[PDB]
Structures are given as structure tokens and as C-alpha cells.
């Protein structure tokens, strides 16, 4: 391949009954977990001197659905270049050609402590909460500007280091429901980027109080807890709900007013409570956006409009393509080949 990177030396090892063939660069691999779509080892990146997560995708081209999902994840990870968002440090295959291309490895930021983990051994100050939520919204302004929706924000998807610096991880490539917006939990209407703002509101409330905000046990129990705080849907929102059955169910509920959040959160920063009221609006079209939230006075000590960048536009037209397995595979291989590592 014209002007491609030199192929590193690979070495083979079996780890949890899985063959891993990775460049010499990655040393001291040790298993961290396994999902349905791949398994993850922590490793020492001898090129950067950092510990990294190396994900080997599990049979990435098994079907059309899996092959397209593999391409979607690689396209997503290659696009995102932001301090508060997971970035692709490396992607490699041991294959020297498309004909032997079978395995895909993704190298990213190693999840040490997530947000749940950091509260288990300390009490966060309001300064800590301000900075953590600011970084989530700064990352979200970036991904939303490219028309990317995370879809599954929760504390276990937010990595935090010892400097209280945060990265958004584990994007939804399309479990607890406590952080999910009501309009997607019951499929009331289409996914909008406003669903990520709802999740931030749930996360922030939990960081401020130490209690999960809506810890329901099923979808109905959860909806009733949500509606108790934010009120039943008004007539404007009911018009936007597409399923008639969902509308009839909502209209069957005893009407409830929105609660006064200041009563619910006595002792919390009033600017924090004001921001929460703007994030946990039931109508998604009235929720504050990530860009607007960064300008809220709650973040006055961190907000810098010259240091809150937006993303390049992200071409998602591939999503409407209907291709053979080997075509998605060939597209994925092209993206592995075209990958340019980040500097340093």
C-alpha cells in the first residue's frame, strides 16, 4: 500500500482461551472484561508510556449486522478528537491483506476509575461537581455538533483520573435505565441529542445528593418516579408522541404538577438546582442544550467560549447503505489502512 505505515512485529499469546496477536509495542496484557462484541485487555503502550485498553472485536464480520456495526464503531472512534471524549489511539490487524483480514483490534483510553468508583472513597466538593459536569457538557457540545448522540450516558461510562479530568466512553452503537430519558425508555418518539442532556441531569443530581434520582425497578415504576418530579405531559408534548397506545396510556395517568426543585434539593448551590431544572424538562425540545448549558452561571469559573471546540461534520450516509458482508468488511479494512495516529 502506497505510503502506508511500516508493519510492526506482532507476537501471539492465548489469554482467556482467546488468541491475541498484537504489535510488540503493547506489553503485559491482562484481561479486564468481555462483552458480546469483544474482549478487553489492559496493556502497557511502550510507545506512549501509558496504560491502554486493547479491545479485540469478537467475530466482527460474522453477519451483515455485525460487519456494519464494526464499521460504524471504527468510523465513530476515528472521528472523535476531543479532550473529554474517548479517542482512537490505534487500530490494527495482524492481516497483511484483505483476504486474510479477520480480526480488528481497537486501542483506547484505559478506564481506571469511573464516576461511581470515585464516590466510593471520597465526598465530592461542589467544585468537583462543577468541574466534572462542565467536562461532560464540553464533550457533549463536541459530539452533538457532529450530530452524534451518545444514547447511554451513565456514571459507569465516564472515566475520571486523579486530576478530576473526565472522558466520555462507551458510545451506544445501537442494563440500568435510571439515566435514560423517558421518551426513549418507552419509545415515545425518535432519538434526539437532548436525551444525553437528561442523562447529565440525572448524573448531576446524584453527584450533589449521593442518591440516585430515579431508581425505578421496571419501565412503569421508573416513569412514575420521573413524572412525580417533572409533571405529567401537557397537551403540547402529547402531540409529539407517535404511538396512539403510548398517548392513551399517558392520558390514563392522574395529572401531576411539576415539583419545585428547590424544595427537593435544599442545601445545594441554587445555580446547580437552576441548571438541573433546565436539564430535566420532560419535553426534550425545551431542554437546555450542551452549548447553552456551558454558558450557565453555575460554570462561570470554568467556562471559556474560546476553549469549547466543535467537531468536524460527520458523514453518516453509510447508515442507509445495504451492502454485502464482504463489502462492509472491505470498507472496514480501508478504514484500518487509512488510520493516522494522534501526535505524541
Amino acid at each position: 500500500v502506497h505510503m502506508s505505515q511500516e508493519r510492526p512485529t506482532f507476537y501471539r499469546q492465548e489469554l482467556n482461551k482467546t488468541i491475541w496477536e498484537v504489535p510488540e509495542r503493547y506489553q503485559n496484557l491482562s484481561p479486564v472484561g468481555s462483552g458480546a462484541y469483544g474482549s478487553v485487555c489492559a496493556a502497557f503502550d511502550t510507545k506512549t508510556g501509558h496504560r491502554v485498553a486493547v479491545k479485540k472485536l469478537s467475530r466482527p464480520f460474522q453477519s451483515i449486522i455485525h460487519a456494519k456495526r464494526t464499521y460504524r464503531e471504527l468510523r465513530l472512534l476515528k472521528h472523535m478528537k476531543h479532550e473529554n471524549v474517548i479517542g482512537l489511539l490505534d487500530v490494527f490487524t495482524p492481516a497483511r491483506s484483505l483476504e486474510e483480514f479477520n480480526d480488528v483490534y481497537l486501542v483506547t483510553h484505559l478506564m481506571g476509575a469511573d464516576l461511581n468508583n470515585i464516590v466510593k472513597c471520597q465526598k465530592l466538593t461542589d467544585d468537583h461537581v462543577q468541574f466534572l459536569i462542565y467536562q461532560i457538557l464540553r464533550g457533549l457540545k463536541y459530539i452533538h455538533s457532529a450530530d452524534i448522540i451518545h444514547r447511554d450516558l451513565k456514571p459507569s461510562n465516564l472515566a475520571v483520573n486523579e486530576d478530576c479530568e473526565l472522558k466520555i466512553l462507551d458510545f451506544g452503537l445501537a442494563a440500568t435505565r435510571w439515566y435514560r430519558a423517558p421518551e426513549i425508555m418507552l419509545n415515545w418518539m425518535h432519538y434526539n441529542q437532548t436525551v444525553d442532556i437528561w442523562s447529565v441531569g440525572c448524573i448531576m443530581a446524584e453527584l450533589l445528593t449521593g442518591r440516585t434520582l430515579f431508581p425505578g425497578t421496571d419501565h412503569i415504576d421508573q416513569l412514575k418516579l420521573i413524572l412525580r418530579l417533572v409533571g405529567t405531559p401537557g397537551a403540547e408534548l402529547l402531540k409529539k408522541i407517535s404511538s396512539e397506545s403510548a398517548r392513551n396510556y399517558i392520558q390514563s395517568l392522574a395529572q401531576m404538577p411539576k415539583m419545585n426543585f428547590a424544595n427537593v434539593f435544599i442545601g445545594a448551590n441554587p445555580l446547580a438546582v437552576d441548571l438541573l431544572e433546565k436539564m430535566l424538562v420532560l419535553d426534550s425540545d425545551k431542554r437546555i442544550t450542551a452549548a447553552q448549558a456551558l454558558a450557565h452561571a453555575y460554570f462561570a469559573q470554568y467556562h471559556d467560549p474560546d476553549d469549547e471546540p466543535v467537531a468536524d461534520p460527520y458523514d453518516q450516509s453509510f447508515e442507509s447503505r445495504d451492502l454485502l458482508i464482504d463489502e462492509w468488511k472491505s470498507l472496514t479494512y480501508d478504514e484500518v489502512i487509512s488510520f493516522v495516529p494522534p501526535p505524541l
Partner: peptide, 7 residues
């Protein structure tokens, strides 16, 4: 913002 302990 200062510093956090690792669990």
C-alpha cells in the same frame, strides 16, 4: 478540581 483519591 484539585485532586482525587483512587479507590
Amino acid at each position: 478540581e484539585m485532586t482525587l483519591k483512587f479507590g
